[PDB]
Every structure is written in C-alpha cells, then in structure tokens.
C-alpha cells in the first residue's frame, strides 16, 4: 500500500494504488483507497482495510453532522484536531494488530493568497500531526521509495498535469521496489486512482488520463 500527495501552484493532488494482500497471497485487485471527505478535503488511510473504511465513513459523518448542526463548516485546524482525536482513540487497538494511518490533503479558502492554499497533513500512531512544508508526502509500506523518487522529480512540477505525472511516476517506482504495492495492469486494465483539489473543489480524475500517463511512463522506461 502506498498513497502519495503533493502540491502544485493552484492546489493539491493525491494518488493511490489498488492492491490488497493477505500475507504473500493476493486478495484484491481493484481496491479504492482514496476518499473525498467534503468539498475541499481528501483523506487516504493505510493499514487494516476494515478500520480504514470505518474511519473514513465516521470522519465524513462527523464533518457533515457539525456542518448541519452549526450552519457553518469547520476550519482546517478543527478538522485536523478531530482527525487527531480519532487516531489517538485507536492506540489500544493499534497495538495487537488493528492499525490505521491517515494522510490528509486540503485547500484552504480562508487563506489570503490563493496560490499558497494547498495543505498536506501527516499523522503518527500516537495521534501527533505534522503540516508538511516541502511540498510532498507519502504513506504506506512503500513510502520511502516514493519519497526518494519525488525528491528528485519535484523540480518538474509546474501545474496539475505535471504533478499528476510525477505522482504516477512515484507510484510506479514504489510498486517497482515493493511487492505489496500494485503496479499498472495492462492485461486487465486497472490503474491507480487520483483526486485533484483546487479553488473549484475536489474532483476525481478520469481513468483515461491516468492510463495515458502510465503508458507513456512504461514506454519511457522500456
């Protein structure tokens, strides 16, 4: 499992793979690991699948409940605090074998400068959170390879297309180096999933663009 997120001038882009394994046996081929929490926020959780889906559905319900009750949406710090509390509450279950690690991406509409409005937040198993300032982050078992690839490929990002290409390349490198991460499937036609957040909101990326980018990358590497 590997989920990447990065910033471009105008917003953020988040991408994730589709492989689910049970030890060394492949169990799932088209799992979706990226969710749209609200109009300007996306979350990606790694670890036990059931805990991840439960956390995602609970977080979405809590945000919607607050928005309906108070008539106004929460600020970014409030959402970070709620997610940190949810993560901290699972420490006892995080031990003994039910662990979930989230990653958050968002667009701040209250920021003075619209260009620097994209935010990426990472979390730890004890509930501590950190706001990234380097422009990219990765979570999962193949996060080190993806981070090392982005460290070299980040100079090419100029807009959304460049960032999406860099994210796909990082996922490809992570799948190349890790056996628990699923690479592109050309026999079946399964590709990673991406979400792009900008001033107009959060939109899912169509699969044709990702397929074209993956084919171009595969041709380049060959």
């Amino acid at each position: 499992t590997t989920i990447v997120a990065l910033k471009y001038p105008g917003g953020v882009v988040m991408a994730g793979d589709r492989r689910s394994t049970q030890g060394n046996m492949i169990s799932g081929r088209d799992v979706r690991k990226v969710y749209i929490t609200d109009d300007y926020t996306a979350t990606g959780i790694a670890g036990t699948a059931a805990v991840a889906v439960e956390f995602a559905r609970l977080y979405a319900v809590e945000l919607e409940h607050y928005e309906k009750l108070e008539g106004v949406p929460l600020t970014f710090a409030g959402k970070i605090n709620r997610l940190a509390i949810m993560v901290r509450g699972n420490l006892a279950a995080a031990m003994q074998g039910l662990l979930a690690l989230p990653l958050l991406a968002g667009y701040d509409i209250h920021a003075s400068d619209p260009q620097s409005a994209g935010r990426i937040v990472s979390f730890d198993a004890a509930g501590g959170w950190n706001i990234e300032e380097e422009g990219y982050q990765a979570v999962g078992s193949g996060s080190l390879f993806a981070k090392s690839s982005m460290k070299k490929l980040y100079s090419q990002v100029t807009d959304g297309d460049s960032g999406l290409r860099v994210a796909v390349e990082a996922l490809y490198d992570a799948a190349d180096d890790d056996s628990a991460t699923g690479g592109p499937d050309l026999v079946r036609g399964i590709f990673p999933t991406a979400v792009i957040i900008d001033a107009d909101g959060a939109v899912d990326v169509p699969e044709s663009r990702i397929a074209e980018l993956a084919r171009a990358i595969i041709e380049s590497r060959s």
Binding site: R57, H65, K68, G71
Partner: protein, 215 residues
Amino acid sequence: SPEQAMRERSELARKGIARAKSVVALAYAGGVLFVAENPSRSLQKISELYDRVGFAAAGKFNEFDNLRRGGIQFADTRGYAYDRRDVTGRQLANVYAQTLGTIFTEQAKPYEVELCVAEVAHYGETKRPELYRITYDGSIADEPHFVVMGGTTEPIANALKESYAENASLTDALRIAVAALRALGVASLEVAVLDANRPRRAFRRITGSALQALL
C-alpha cells in the same frame, strides 16, 4: 379534573400559535418551496434535516430549535446505522409526533410550536413530494398540496386554495405564495427550496440579488 387541565393547556398552545408569524410550504415541479416572514438574518425557521428532507417550524425559536437538533441527530445515527437511502421523512414525522405528545402530556408547560416535514424523490426518479404537518398535541397529518402554519391562516389558506396551480414554475409559485402571504421585499423574507434535480443534497437557500431578480 383532567378535562379542565387539557382544555387550559390546549388554549395556551392555541394562543401561543396564534400570536406568531406565518410559514408557507408549497409543492411545485422542481420540488418543495418554503416561504417565511423573518426580518432577522441570524435566526432561521427553515432548515435541512437530511439529503432530501426539509424542516419548517412556527412558534417560539428556542422551542423548535431543540426539536430540529434532535431530528438531525436521529437522522445521522440512523443513516450510519443502516444506510443513507434507508432514511425517510415519515420516520422523522413519527418521532416528532411522539416527542410532542410526550411533552404535551408530561411537561408542566406545553410547547407552542407547529412543525412541517417535507420530502422529495431521489435523483433520477419520479415521485410526488410528501408533506407532513405536526401540531402541539402530537397529531400528525398528511397534506398533498400545501401547508400553512402560524398566525391567522384562514385568509392565506383561502387565497392559496383559490390560486393553487399544479406543476407550476418556480417564479410563478413564489409570486403566488407571496401574494397569498400578503393577504415584503428582500428584507423580512426567508425563501428555501428542495431541488429534486440536485445529485445528493437538495436543500438550498435563495437570498440576495437572486431573490430580488426572482421577485
């Protein structure tokens, strides 16, 4: 004697309802339209309960605000319990009726409120909108065309009955409702709609320049 107590409580509730403003809910081709006369921009009488459910109230603000909060809690807990598509307005109306009956029976002072619950169809489907009216004592009724609550409703009801037209447009329905309520500019007006054409959430407010353009 129980008779005298019930009569006195009913009279108190009737006076409290009668000394309030008027709220009108209509059904048009696009869904449900709520119109109320409210000068304040911070206190609201029309709200959203769930994806396709809308709530309207007449009476004391602090009395139906608690009911609205309770209804939202019930809907979110049921949606997480089973599914989002297993929540309907009839269950909310029944819960409101039970709560109002219990309050009218046990509490020292009855609530001076009148409630209306509206529901529209899901996206990509054809179905008649449903309107339920709940009174202070717990009685629940189903209204096919329109609901008028609060104040002196007889002239408004007569005007709406004489002027109601099925499958009307948004502007025509808004003008008809405004004329019925008059018998009212940008200020002292609260207008909301349940848009059946919206994908997931149907409730939306019409305020500002758009309201004047449509008026």
